[PDB]
Amino acid sequence: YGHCVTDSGVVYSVGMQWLKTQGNKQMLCTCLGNGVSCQETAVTQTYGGNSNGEPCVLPFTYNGRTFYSCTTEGRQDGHLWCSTTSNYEQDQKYSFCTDHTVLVQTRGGNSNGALCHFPFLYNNHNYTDCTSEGRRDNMKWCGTTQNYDADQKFGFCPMA
Ligand SMILES: *[C@@H]1O[C@H](CO)[C@@H](O)[C@H](O)[C@H]1NC(C)=O
Secondary structure, X not given: OOOEEEOOOEEEOOOEEEEEEOOOOEEEEEEOOOOOEEXXXXXXXXXXXXXXXXXXXXXXXXXXXXXXXXXXXXOOOOOEEEOOOOOHXXXXXXXXXXXXXXXXXXXXXXXXXXXXXXOOEEOOEOOOOOOOOOOOOOOOEEEOOOEHHHHOOEEEOOOO
């Protein structure tokens, strides 16, 4: 009951996302009991902006850097934004996104290589970063869901 097994024995509890190769690209596959909800590496839930919150069109460089996804670059409202056209500076088009659909690829603990979700609640104490609670060895970790302590599933974060 609950959770879903995939890959080669990697079961990810419901409401749990995890990156996986679906041919020749990365895909966002999350377990929800009723089945894994895979979603190609599509843009983020854009909104507002001078593009009707439509979809983005990256990679899109700005200020001198090449952004592959949404970014708060120059954003003073908090949310992020993404170019709504291959040639951003060209059509000066863009669109705001939500928490740049953050996606952490954690592994270890009790999530077995699970796409750590951020933010993540820990002991009714909301969190937003690979916290080292209970660990004394350089191995920052986070919750595989919006409520780690609520699902009892954690995972180690990347090297950086
Ligand atoms: C964590 O944040 C969410 C949304 O901000 C809120 O609904 C939830 O109650 C918070 N958790 C705690 C323990 O305050």
